[model samples]
Each structure stands twice: as structure tokens, then as C-alpha cells.
Target: DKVMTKDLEIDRATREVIFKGDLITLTRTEFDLLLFLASNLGRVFTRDELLDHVWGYNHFPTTRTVDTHVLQLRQKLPGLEIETLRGVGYKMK
Candidate 1:
């Protein structure tokens, strides 16, 4: 599946992300996070859920990892909409 907005394009089949027609390089984790969020657009996900789904169930990383990656994603994809739900978690807008 692919996710396309005015400023971003994410191709799940190819695992490629393009911003304004230019390719954007992202870490493996970053790409996974973006794919999960973009694929489930408008749905909120808790940090734990994100970690389990994106990082895998066997891996246990601090919840802060999610925040850090989210920050990086926000910076890399300037117009990409990622909404924070205060103490809940995050969602793609």
C-alpha cells in the first residue's frame, strides 16, 4: 500500500519515502514508524503499541525511544502531520 499527501509519499511495497518528488533517507526504525502511522492514519497508538508493532515484541526499549523517533520524523518530514494526544500517545493527522 502507499500513502500520499500533498507533501509526502510513502510506498510500502518499495519501502520508499518521497517528499516533493525527492527521496528521503530514513533509519530503519524511522521508516517503520512512519509506515505504521501512515498506514493507520488518524488512529491513535500508544508508545507501547508502537514499540511492539514497529520494534517487535521481543525488543523492549524505553518509551522515550518513541518520542525521539517521532521528533526525528517530524523534522525530516516537515509538513507531515503527526498529532500528539497529551498523555495518551500519537496519531497521524
Candidate 2:
């Protein structure tokens, strides 16, 4: 089944995302992150919470990789609503 968003459709079978009628390329990690959040829309989470759910690791270190990834996602998927709750975490709308 294709997971449908506002203007994006995700085909898990092919791991391809179609946004605004065009194919959007996403790395595996990016796809996973997007899918995870998409699967649970309108949910809030802390950075540590996201790390545990998405990466399966403890938020032991001050790793900003997630931040960088979110930045990339924000840049690439401009139409997608990814809200950042300053000091708390991020969630997809």
C-alpha cells in the first residue's frame, strides 16, 4: 500500500516517494525517519525519543546527526510540514 500524505505518496514496496507528482529521492535513513514519523502523524517526541525509536540507540552522546538529517529533510521536502518544538523535539504535521 502507498502511504499518502498531503501531496506525497510513499511506496514501501519500491521504497520510492512521490511528492507533488514527482519522485523524491531519499536516503535509506531519511526514508526510515520519514516513514516512522509519517506512520505516527501528529505525535511529539524528544530528540532522545526519536533516537530510540528511529535509530535504536541510547541518547548518550550529544549527537547532532539527527539534527543534520532533519535539516536535509527540511531542505529537500519543502512541502512537508516538519515542526520543531524548540528545546523539546520535532514532529511531523
Candidate 3:
């Protein structure tokens, strides 16, 4: 219930996040990526690690997908802390 409990005070239920009382519309894939990272906050998920967790495909090389989605998520979810490690993937704070 991470998605539901994140904002228990909100009367409406939303898998899509509305950060800081702002309505943020995210793509289907963007939501998935956000949810995955939010669920594992403070955990630095590498590019390959995130690809496996979010994409569900291992041993494949596709880092661009991660970058594109992160860019979208940052635009939608304002005030969120998305830290980037040079070679590592990303993590939410």
C-alpha cells in the first residue's frame, strides 16, 4: 500500500502521484519507475539494477530507457529528490 499510504490524508485514491498538492500526470512507464524507486527510497539503484527491477529483463543493455524515464519523472514530480551518481543509476530521497 505504498502508493495508497503515501498520502493518507488525500480523500481520493491515485496510483498517479500528486506531489505537494500539485496534480502531476505521469506516463504509465513513468509511474512504474517512480513507484519502484519510491518503494526503495535511499537505495541507490544502478542503471543495470533499475533496468532489471523496472523492465524485468536481465542481462540486457539499455541505459537510455532509464535516462528518458527519469527525465519525465522529474518534470512531473516536482520537489522530489532524484540524485544521480556519475556511473550509477539513480535513487530517490
Candidate 4:
């Protein structure tokens, strides 16, 4: 089913993204990262939380990976506002 306002669909079985009625290619890891954030809309998830959720390996110190992926996501999704809480985390509407 399409997420109306965003014009994106989540294919749970394939874990793929359909953007603007067309398939947008994403790496497996990228898809996972996007899925996690999209699924948890409005909740600010820190880099530590994302690392634990997506990688299943907690205790990682750096927030760089999360920042990088979020940057890429912003580029791909364009207008969607994925907020960055300074010294905190990311949140999406």
C-alpha cells in the first residue's frame, strides 16, 4: 500500500521502496535503514538506537554511520523533512 502524502510504498515482503510509483534502487542496508526510520515516524531515534536496531550490535560509540545514512536518505527523498535534534537524534513527520 502507498503511504499517501509521501508517495512512497513499503513492500514488507521484499523490503523495497516504490517512490512516485517507480522503484528506487537501494542497497539492502540502505533499505533496512530507511525502513526502520520510516516505520518509526515522529520518534526521535538516536544513532545508538539506530545502530542497535539495524545492526543488532549495540555499544557502538560513533554517530557517523547514522549521519551518513540520514544524509543519503535526505538526498533520495528530497522534500521530506527528516529532522536532526542537535546533540540528540533524528525525527520524521
Per lDDT, the best of the predicted structures is 1
Q: Which regions of candidate 1 fall more than 4 Å away from where they truly are?
A: 61-93
| lDDT string, candidate 1, 16-58, tens digits | 9998989999888899998888778779999878888898875
Q: Which scores greater on TM-score, model 3 or model 4?
A: 4
Note the residue pairs that clash in candidate 4.
none
lDDT of 2 at 44: 85
| Model 1: pairs clashing at backbone N, Cα or C within 3 Å | none
Compute the lDDT for candidate 2: 0.79
Instruction: Write the residue-wise lDDT of candidate 4 on 12-73 in tens digits.
Output: 67767887889898887787777888777789998767877786664464577788889999
Measured with C-alpha atoms, the lDDT of residue 86 in candidate 1 is 87
Better of 1 and 2 by lDDT: 1
List TM-score per model, in order.
0.56, 0.55, 0.47, 0.53
* Ten contiguous residues minimizing lDDT sum, candidate 3: 4-13
At residue 48, candidate 2 shows an lDDT of: 62
How high is the CA lDDT of each candidate model?
0.86, 0.79, 0.68, 0.77
* Prediction 4 global C-alpha lDDT: 0.77
Model 3, residue 32: distance off in Å is: 0.9
The TM-score of candidate 4 is 0.53
Q: For model 2, how does the per-residue alpha-carbon lDDT over 1-93 read when each residue is reduced to its tens digit?
A: 888878778887888988899988999778877877777788987876777667666445444677778899988988779888887788998
Model 2: residues >4 Å from true position, as ranges? 57-93
